[PDB]
Design a protein around this ligand. Structure first.
Ligand SMILES: Nc1ncnc2c1ncn2[C@@H]1O[C@H](COP(=O)(O)OP(=O)(O)OP(=O)(O)O)[C@@H](O)[C@H]1O
Ligand SMILES: [K+]
Ligand SMILES: [K+]
Ligand SMILES: [K+]
Ligand SMILES: [K+]
Ligand SMILES: [K+]
Ligand SMILES: [K+]
Ligand SMILES: [K+]
Ligand SMILES: [K+]
Ligand SMILES: [Mg+2]
Ligand SMILES: [Mg+2]
Ligand SMILES: [Mg+2]
Ligand SMILES: [Mg+2]
Ligand SMILES: [Mg+2]
Ligand SMILES: [Mg+2]
Ligand SMILES: [Mg+2]
Ligand SMILES: [Mg+2]
Ligand SMILES: [Mg+2]
Ligand SMILES: [Mg+2]
Ligand SMILES: [Mg+2]
Lengths: 105, 126, 402, 119, 55, 124, 98, 79
RNA sequence: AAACUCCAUAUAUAUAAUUUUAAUUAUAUAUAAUUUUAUAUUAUUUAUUAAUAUAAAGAAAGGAAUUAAGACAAUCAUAAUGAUCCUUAUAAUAUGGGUAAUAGACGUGCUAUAAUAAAAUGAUAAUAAAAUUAUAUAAAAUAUAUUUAAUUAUAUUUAAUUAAUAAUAUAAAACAUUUUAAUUUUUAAUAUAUUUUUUUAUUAUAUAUUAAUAUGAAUUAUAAUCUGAAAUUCGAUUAUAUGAAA
C-alpha cells in the first residue's frame, strides 16, 4: 500500500515500465547543496508514503500518460524471429580435419 | 580526432596500472555545425562559401572502482592533458536511502524590499 | 442534358456497384451453399440458393467494393477454418453472441453473409443492420418521443421495417401470433381519413400484419418497439440479429444530431442505439434458445481501446480519454457475454481453389495464364496478398495492371 | 424556391449552409445553433421545410441582430473613428488600409471598400 | 478519467507540497515565471571581452 | 591475403543480409520455408500498402523461381516505403546466394544485387 | 492490357511531318519516322482529350469508357491519324534519304 | 493590442497642475493610454516635429495619445 | 594541368561489459575501379585496333577541391593608406518621428480561380532525415475558449535534459472511409426490387445565370491573447462577424 502511494505522489518522476524513480535538482549553486535537497525530498516522500493513517490513495490508479508520451518518441523494435521458422537441421555441420585432429595429440 | 584518440589511449594505460577496469573509447556520433557565407557577388555564381566544424566524441567508462582511485585517475590525466581536448566526467555514487547529515532568490528579496518602500507602502495602506 | 439515360456518370466505386456490369459475366455452374451438407462443399467455391440470394439482397449482405460485378452472382468459398468453424460454434454454443473480427479485407462481411445464408435455410428470422452509420451521421430526420424518452428516426425506421418484411419468409412471420393488442395512427393513403387508427388484436393478427402497419412518422418509434417485443416474447421462430460495421457504433458514441441546446446527442439516447445495445447486452431476451446475435467490425472504421478491452485482449486503462475508450459500451458488451471469432487468413490451398475458380470465370489476365506455371502463380499471389488476405488477392489479379 | 425574410433559396440547399450564406451576420456556428434550436436535423434541405417551420426560422432570425441592424453597427463604429479624429478614422476617409498594410504597392481592395459608409 | 477530480486534486496538492512546487489550483496569473527566469546579465555584459586586459 | 570469408547459414539455417536504398536500411532473415513473409513483425499487406512495393520485394524470389520455398523475416528502418521495400529487395537477393551460389549470375543479370547509389543531392 | 496495346498500335501515326528551319529560306516540311515510345505519347494524348469530353466526374470512369469505345472500333482520333498520314504522303518527295 | 489583464499603459504626466490650473499638458508620450481622468483636459501631443493641441472627450478613453497626432503629411502627386 | 587527394558507396579489422541501443548503429584504420576478360559484327592507320552487340567476373553507379597571367567591374554599409574638408560641430547624448508615405511603372515571391482535387476522420499510434536546447528546449496534467471527448489556441504548473540518454517532435503527402457547388448528375414523399450504403417508377425539388459556390480569403467591425518598459504611427496569434478580385 505504501509503495502504491509513493508511485502516485511521484507523478511524472516514476516510470512504471522501468520502475525507476528519478529526480534531479540544479537549483542551488553547489552540487553538495543540491544533493542534500534531493535527499531531503526523498525522506519527505517516503515519510508521507509510509503514513497511511489518513489516506492511502488505493482508489486512485497509477497514471502512466507521461510515460506513454515518452514511448511514442522512441522507436520500438519489439519483433523477434519466429521460433517455428527455425531450421536447425540446415545449419552447416563441422567437418572432420585430420590435421587439426592430429595436431592436438 | 588525432589528439582525441591518442589521449584516449593514454587514459586506458593510466587506468590499467591504477587497477580500474575501463571500456572504450566508444565513438559517439560526431556533431557537425555548418555556416554559409554569401560572398560579394551573390549573383547565384560561386557566391556562397561553406564552412563546418566537427565535434569528435569518445566515451571511456570505468567500473568496479573505489572513489579515491577514480579521483587519482582524473587528477593524473588532467595534469597531462593534450591541446584542444575537453573532458566531462559523470560520477555515479550508490548510497543508502537514509543518510546522516545529508549528502531566498535575489529577485524575491528585492520584491520584499520594494513592497516595503514608501512608494509602495503608501498604497497598501488599507 | 449532359447525362443520357445510360451514361456512366458516377465515380468509379459507385459505377462498379451500380452499373450492372455483371451482365456480361459468363454463367458458371457451381454447387449451392447448404450447411446441412457442408461435407460436399467444404473448401469449394459455391453460389447461394435462389431463396438465399433474394433474402441477402434485401438484408444488405452484399456490399460495394467486393468485386461482385466480376461474377454473375456473388460467390463464396466455403472454408473449414472460417465458415465451418464459425457455423459449428453458432449451432452448439449456448449463449450464441459473437463479434467477428480480423484484419481489413479478411472476409468478415462474407462470413456474416454465410451466417445469413445459414439462417435463411434453417427457418430463422433475420434482423440485419448493415450500415449503422446511416442512423448516426445526421442525414435523416429525428424526433423525440415522450412516451419512450428516446430520439426516434422515422425515415430510417421505415426502411428498416421493410427490410425485415421483404427479407424474411412470410410463413415464419405469420406463424408468430401477436401477444398484445396494439393501436397505431393510420397513415394508409386509402382509408386514413376514414379510420383514425388501425387496431391489431391479439391471437388474431400476426407479426406479419404488424410489419405492414402504415403509421405517421411520430408513431413509428412505437411500432419498432412493438415489433421487437413481439419477436422477443415468441418462442416459435429463432431470431438472428446482426450488425455489420459495428466498429462504427463503438467508436461513435455521440451522433451528429444536436438537441435544442446545441449539444450532440449520445448514441444510447437514440432508439436505434438503445435497441441495438439492449439486444447485445441481454436486456432484451429472446424466448427461443436458437436466437443469436452476430456482430462484425470493419476496417474502414477507426480503432481504439473500447473493443479490445471489452474482449479481454488488453487491461483497462482508466486514464484513457473518452474519445478513445467508452466504458459504458464495454460494460454492455461484457454483460452480454459476447465472444470473439477472428477470421483467419487464407492458406495456400485455399488460395489455389480461389485462383482455380477465377481462371474458370475468365477474370485472370493473360500474363498469369500464358507462359507462367500454375504453381508459380499460386506462390506469387499468396506472397503478394499478404499470405492470405482475400481482398489483396483479388486486387493482385484484376486490379494490378503494372 | 423557399423564401425566408425575403431571401430566396434553391430547394436543394442545405439549411445550415444556406442561412450562413444569404444572411448578413450569420456564420457557420450561428446557423447550426438556429437549426438545432428549431429541431432541424443537421443536413436537412430547404425543400423539406414546411410553412410552420419556415415561420419558425423567420421568428428566430427576427430576434437576432442581422441584415440592416448588423450592418448599421459596423457603419456606426466606423463613423465614431472619424468623429474622434483618430488615425484609423482618417484612413477610412481616405480609402486607405486601416490595419498597417503597406501602400507603396497593392492596397487595391482598401481603395475599393474602405469608406465611412462601408457596405 | 473515472477518478474523481477531488481525489486527483488531493494528490496534486500533496505532491506539490512534498516537491516544493507552487500549487495554483485556480490558475490566477501569479508572475512565478518572472521569479524563476535565469539572470542573463553576466553573459550579456561580457559580450565584448574582459576589460581588464594589459595595455 | 584476402578479406572475404565464405558466407554460410547460421545455427538456425538462416541467411542474413543487409540492404540499403536512399536513406532506408533493411536486415532480412531468409530460411527455407513455404513463402511466409513478415515486415517488422507485421503482415506484408499491412506494412506496404502499394502493390508495386510488394512486387519489388518478390522480384528476387521470382528470378530464381523460389517464391514458395523460403520464409522471410524482414526488418527495415529509415526513409520511406519505396526505400525500405527496395532495400528489402536488395537484401533478399544478397541472402539467396548462400543457398545456391550457382544462381548469383542470374541475380546479377536481373539487377537485384546492385546497390542503387542514387540519393537526394544538395543542389550545387 | 492487350486491348490497350492494340488500340495504341492502331491509333498512333507511324510517321509525322515536322518543319525544319533549314536555310534562311522557308523551312521544309519533311516526314519523320516515330519510335514506339513517341507513338504511344501521341495516341495517349488523343485518348485523354477524348476521355475528358465524357460526363463522369471521375477521370478513371471517363478513361475507362473511352478505352472501351476504342476497343470496340469507335473513336474520333482515327481521323487525326488519317490527317497526319495524308500530309506525310503529300510530302513524300521532300524526304532526304541521305 | 496590450492585454487587458496587464492594465493601462500609465506614464508619468503632470495632471494635477492641468486640473487645478487648466494649463495644457505638453508631452511626447504618444504611447500613453488616455485614462478616464484625462477627459476634459487639454494635451499638446508631439508628432515628431510639432505639438498638436487636442482636448480629450469621453469617446477617446482607452485609445492612445499618438492616435490623434498624425506624423505624416497626406500624399500628393505632381499630376 | 592531370595524376594525386578527400567525400560518397562496397568490404575488412578494431572499439561498445548491445539500458546513452539506432549493432538495421556509431567512427577510427585499411582495401577496392581511371574496372576487367572472351567472342561475333562493322569500320580502321586491318593490328596486339576502335565502334558495337554477346557471354563471363564485379557492390561499383556520383561528386569535390585544383595554374599563373591578361583584360575589365564594384565603395567593400564587407578592410586599409595618403590627401582633402568640419572642430560649440559635418563630432557626442536623450525624447519623439521617419526608414512602413502613395498617382503610375518594374522585379521576385505567396495564396488562389474545384472533381487525374479540395475538405473532414483514422490511438496497442504507417513510414524520415538533418539540426537545435546554460543569453535554454519545454513533457505530462489541469483550466478557459467549449461542447462527452478529441482537435486548435492561450493560461496555470515547470517533469526530464545541457544531451547517441530528456525535450522541440506521434513527420507530411501516401493509403482507406465520408463529403463536395456548378449538376434535375441532387434531395424528398410513396410504391418497387435477386443492385438494398442500391435499382426502377410517379410526383414535387426555383428562378436567375457567363456565371463566384459549401471555390477563393482580400478588406473590415468587435472581443481576447503573446513578446516587451512600451505594439499610436508600426508587430504576431485566436474567436465571432464580414466574404473583395480571380
Ligand atoms: N470466403 C470467401 N470467398 C470468396 N471471396 C471472399 C471470401 N472472403 C472474402 N472474400 C473477398 O474478399 C474481399 C473482402 O471481403 P469482405 O468485404 O468480406 O472483407 P472484410 O474483412 O469484411 O472487409 P472490411 O474490413 O473492409 O469491412 C471481397 O472481394 C470478398 O469477395
Ligand atoms: K453570412
Ligand atoms: K503603411
Ligand atoms: K510589386
Ligand atoms: K541493439
Ligand atoms: K520607426
Ligand atoms: K480544389
Ligand atoms: K518524425
Ligand atoms: K500597433
Ligand atoms: Mg527539474
Ligand atoms: Mg502531446
Ligand atoms: Mg530522444
Ligand atoms: Mg466488411
Ligand atoms: Mg526599406
Ligand atoms: Mg509511428
Ligand atoms: Mg502539453
Ligand atoms: Mg501518425
Ligand atoms: Mg491528410
Ligand atoms: Mg468576377
Ligand atoms: Mg471555404
Amino acid at each position: 500500500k505504501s509503495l502504491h502511494k509513493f508511485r502516485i505522489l511521484a507523478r511524472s518522476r516514476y516510470d512504471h515500465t522501468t520502475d525507476i524513480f528519478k529526480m534531479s535538482s540544479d537549483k542551488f549553486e553547489h552540487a553538495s547543496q543540491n544533493a542534500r535537497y534531493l535527499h531531503d525530498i526523498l525522506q519527505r516522500l517516503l515519510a508521507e508514503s509510509k503514513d497511511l493513517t489518513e489516506d492511502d490513495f488505493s482508489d486512485v490508479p497509477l497514471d502512466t500518460r507521461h510515460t506513454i508520451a515518452k514511448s511514442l518518441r522512441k522507436k520500438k523494435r519489439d519483433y523477434e524471429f519466429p521460433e517455428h521458422w527455425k531450421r536447425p537441421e540446415d545449419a552447416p555441420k563441422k567437418k572432420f580435419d585430420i590435421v587439426d585432429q592430429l595436431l592436438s595429440t | 580526432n588525432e589528439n582525441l584518440d591518442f589521449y584516449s589511449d593514454f587514459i586506458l594505460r593510466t587506468g590499467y596500472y591504477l587497477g580500474i577496469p575501463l571500456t572504450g573509447p566508444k565513438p559517439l556520433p560526431t556533431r557537425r555545425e555548418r555556416w554559409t557565407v554569401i560572398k560579394s557577388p551573390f549573383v547565384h555564381a560561386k557566391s556562397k562559401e561553406n564552412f563546418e566544424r566537427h565535434t569528435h566524441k569518445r566515451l571511456i567508462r570505468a567500473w568496479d572502482t573505489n572513489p579515491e582511485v577514480l579521483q587519482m585517475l582524473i587528477a593524473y590525466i588532467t595534469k597531462h592533458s593534450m591541446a584542444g581536448v575537453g573532458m566531462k566526467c559523470n560520477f555515479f555514487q550508490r548510497s543508502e536511502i537514509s543518510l546522516d547529515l545529508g549528502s531566498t532568490s535575489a529577485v524575491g528579496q528585492k520584491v520584499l524590499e520594494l513592497l516595503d518602500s514608501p512608494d509602495f507602502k503608501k498604497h497598501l495602506e488599507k | 442534358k449532359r447525362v443520357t439515360p445510360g451514361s456512366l456518370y458516377k465515380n468509379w466505386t459507385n459505377t462498379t456497384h451500380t452499373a450492372q456490369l455483371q451482365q456480361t459475366a459468363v454463367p458458371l455452374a457451381l454447387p449451392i451453399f447448404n450447411f446441412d451438407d457442408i461435407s460436399k462443399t467444404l473448401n469449394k467455391v459455391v453460389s447461394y440458393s435462389n431463396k438465399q440470394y433474394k433474402s441477402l439482397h434485401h438484408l444488405g449482405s452484399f456490399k460495394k467494393s467486393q468485386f461482385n460485378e466480376l461474377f454473375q452472382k456473388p460467390v463464396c468459398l466455403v472454408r473449414e477454418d472460417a465458415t465451418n468453424s464459425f457455423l459449428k460454434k453458432l449451432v452448439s454454443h449456448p449463449v450464441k453472441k459473437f463479434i467477428i473480427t480480423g484484419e481489413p479485407g479478411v472476409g468478415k462481411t462474407v462470413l456474416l453473409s454465410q451466417a445469413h445464408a445459414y439462417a435463411v435455410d434453417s427457418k430463422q428470422i433475420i434482423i440485419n443492420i448493415s450500415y449503422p452509420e446511416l442512423f448516426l451521421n445526421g442525414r435523416n430526420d429525428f424526433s423525440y418521443d415522450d412516451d419512450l424518452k428516446l430520439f426516434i428516426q422515422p425515415m430510417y425506421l421505415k426502411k428498416l421495417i421493410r427490410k425485415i418484411l421483404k427479407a424474411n419468409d412470410p410463413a415464419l412471420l405469420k406463424s408468430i401470433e401477436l401477444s398484445k393488442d396494439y393501436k397505431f395512427s393510420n397513415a394508409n393513403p386509402k382509408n386514413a381519413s376514414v379510420k383514425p387508427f388501425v387496431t391489431l388484436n391479439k391471437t388474431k393478427n400476426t407479426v406479419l400484419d404488424l410489419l405492414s402497419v402504415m403509421t405517421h412518422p411520430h408513431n413509428r418509434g412505437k411500432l419498432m418497439k412493438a415489433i421487437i417485443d413481439e419477436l422477443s416474447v415468441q418462442s416459435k421462430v429463432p431470431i438472428m440479429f446482426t450488425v455489420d460495421n459495428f466498429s462504427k457504433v463503438l467508436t461513435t458514441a455521440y451522433s451528429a444530431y444536436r438537441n435544442t441546446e446545441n449539444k450532440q446527442i449520445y448514441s444510447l439516447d437514440l432508439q436505434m442505439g438503445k435497441l441495438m445495445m439492449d439486444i447485445i447486452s441481454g436486456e432484451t431476451k429472446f424466448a427461443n434458445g436458437e436466437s443469436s446475435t452476430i456482430l462484425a467490425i470493419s476496417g474502414v472504421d477507426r480503432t481504439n481501446k473500447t473493443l479490445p478491452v471489452a474482449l479481454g485482449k488488453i487491461p483497462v486503462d482508466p486514464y484513457v480519454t473518452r474519445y478513445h475508450y467508452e466504458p459504458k459500451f464495454v460494460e454492455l458488451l461484457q454483460k452480454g457475454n459476447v465472444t470473439e471469432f477472428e477470421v483467419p487468413k487464407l492458406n495456400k490451398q485455399e488460395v489455389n481453389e480461389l485462383i482455380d475458380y477465377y481462371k474458370q470465370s475468365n477474370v485472370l489476365l493473360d500474363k498469369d495464364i500464358t507462359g507462367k506455371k500454375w504453381e508459380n502463380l499460386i506462390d506469387e499471389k499468396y506472397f503478394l496478398s499478404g499470405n492470405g488476405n482475400p481482398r489483396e488477392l483479388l486486387k493482385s489479379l484484376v486490379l494490378s495492371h503494372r | 424556391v423557399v423564401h425566408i425574410l425575403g431571401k430566396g433559396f434553391k430547394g436543394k440547399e442545405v439549411i445550415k449552409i444556406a442561412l450562413a450564406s444569404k444572411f448578413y451576420g450569420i456564420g457557420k456556428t450561428t446557423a447550426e445553433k438556429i437549426c438545432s434550436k428549431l429541431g432541424l436535423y443537421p443536413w436537412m434541405r430547404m425543400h423539406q421545410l414546411s410553412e410552420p417551420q419556415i415561420m419558425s426560422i423567420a421568428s428566430e432570425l427576427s430576434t437576432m441582430t442581422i441584415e440592416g441592424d448588423a450592418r448599421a453597427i459596423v457603419k456606426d463604429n466606423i463613423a465614431l473613428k472619424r468623429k474622434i479624429g483618430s488615425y484609423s478614422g482618417m484612413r477610412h476617409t481616405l480609402h486607405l488600409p486601416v490595419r498597417g498594410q503597406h501602400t507603396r504597392n497593392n492596397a487595391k481592395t482598401a481603395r475599393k471598400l474602405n469608406k465611412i459608409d462601408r457596405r | 478519467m473515472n477518478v474523481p477530480k477531488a481525489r486527483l486534486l488531493k494528490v496534486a496538492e500533496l505532491s506539490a507540497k512534498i516537491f516544493d512546487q507552487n500549487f495554483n489550483p485556480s490558475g490566477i496569473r501569479t508572475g512565478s515565471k518572472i521569479l524563476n527566469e535565469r539572470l542573463k546579465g553576466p553573459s550579456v555584459a561580457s559580450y565584448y571581452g574582459n576589460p581588464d586586459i594589459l595595455k | 591475403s584476402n578479406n572475404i570469408k565464405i558466407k554460410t547459414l547460421d545455427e538456425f539455417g538462416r541467411s542474413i543480409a543487409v540492404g540499403k536504398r536512399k536513406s532506408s536500411t533493411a536486415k532480412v532473415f531468409v530460411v527455407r520455408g513455404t513463402g511466409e513473409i513478415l515486415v517488422n513483425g507485421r503482415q506484408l499487406n499491412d506494412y506496404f500498402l502499394k502493390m508495386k512495393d510488394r512486387e519489388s520485394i518478390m522480384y528476387p524470389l521470382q528470378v530464381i523461381e523460389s517464391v514458395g520455398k523460403y520464409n522471410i523475416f524482414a526488418t527495415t528502418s529509415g526513409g520511406g516505403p519505396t526505400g525500405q521495400a527496395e532495400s528489402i529487395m536488395h537484401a533478399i537477393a544478397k541472402a539467396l546466394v548462400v543457398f545456391n551460389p550457382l544462381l548469383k549470375s542470374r541475380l546479377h543479370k536481373a539487377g537485384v544485387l546492385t546497390r542503387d547509389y542514387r540519393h537526394v543531392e544538395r543542389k550545387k | 492490357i492487350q486491348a490497350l496495346e492494340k488500340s495504341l498500335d492502331e491509333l498512333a501515326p507511324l510517321m509525322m511531318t515536322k518543319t525544319f528551319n533549314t536555310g534562311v529560306a522557308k523551312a521544309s516540311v519533311i516526314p519523320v519516322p516515330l519510335n514506339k515510345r513517341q507513338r504511344n505519347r501521341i495516341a495517349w494524348n488523343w485518348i485523354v482529350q477524348s476521355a475528358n469530353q465524357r460526363v463522369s466526374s471521375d477521370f478513371a470512369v471517363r478513361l475507362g469508357e473511352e478505352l472501351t469505345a476504342i476497343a470496340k472500333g469507335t473513336s474520333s482520333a482515327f481521323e487525326k491519324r488519317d490527317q497526319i498520314h495524308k500530309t506525310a504522303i503529300a510530302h513524300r518527295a521532300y524526304i532526304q534519304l541521305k | 493590442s496590450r492585454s487587458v489583464w496587464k492594465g493601462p499603459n500609465i506614464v508619468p504626466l503632470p495632471i494635477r497642475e492641468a486640473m487645478t490650473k487648466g494649463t495644457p499638458i505638453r508631452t511626447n508620450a504618444r504611447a500613453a493610454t488616455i485614462l478616464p481622468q484625462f477627459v476634459g483636459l487639454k494635451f499638446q501631443i508631439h508628432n515628431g516635429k510639432e505639438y498638436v493641441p487636442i482636448e480629450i472627450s469621453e469617446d477617446m478613453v482607452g485609445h492612445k495619445l499618438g492616435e490623434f497626432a498624425p506624423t505624416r503629411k497626406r500624399f500628393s502627386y505632381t499630376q
